[PDB]
Design a protein around this ligand. Structure first.
Ligand SMILES: CCCCCC/C=C/CCCCCCCC(=O)O
Length: 153
């Protein structure tokens, strides 16, 4: 679904550094690719890093990525495949998660992505996520969690 994005939310330099787990998406992508771990390093206001994942069809994958950041949006570039390469806008910022939205080739009608600091986010985090989504005209009921990993949601 299309969000109502907040036009006053901008990415703070270095906010994306470190390890993240992409555990909730809309539409649900987890039958195609799952157990997504991201690691980002700062390059000025940009980032470089890696994304590792499990694919039922391709096996274990490791990808090198770049993020170029421009205000409330960034461009995501991956080396080997470009299924998820797109501009993504920030929808919500929290100490424990970020919510992004874009229209990549893999989900060209729109893809909302929730990146968590914790590998298995607990109920208090999910409650905050639900409120963040409502604030941008989205709804957790249209999202799927990654139930391929050792986490109950
Ligand atoms: C928390 C910082 C997030 C910044 C990046 C926002 C967009 C991310 C897109 C991630 C794509 C997920 C790739 C899945 C693995 C694959 O199929 O290659």
């Amino acid at each position: 679904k299309e969000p109502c994005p907040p036009e006053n939310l901008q990415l703070t330099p270095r906010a994306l550094v470190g390890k993240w787990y992409l555990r909730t998406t809309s539409p649900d992508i987890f039958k195609q690719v799952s157990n997504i771990t991201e690691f980002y390093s700062a390059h000025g206001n940009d980032y470089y890093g890696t994304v590792t994942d499990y694919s039922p069809e391709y096996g274990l994958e490791a990808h090198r990525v770049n993020l170029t950041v421009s205000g409330r949006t960034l461009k995501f570039y991956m080396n080997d495949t470009h299924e998820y390469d797109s501009e993504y806008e920030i929808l919500a910022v929290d100490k424990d998660y970020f919510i992004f939205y874009g229209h990549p080739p893999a989900a060209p009608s729109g893809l909302a992505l929730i990146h968590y600091r914790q590998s298995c986010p607990k109920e208090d985090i999910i409650k905050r996520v639900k409120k963040s989504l409502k604030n941008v005209c989205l709804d957790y009921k249209y999202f799927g969690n990654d139930t391929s990993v050792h986490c109950r949601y």
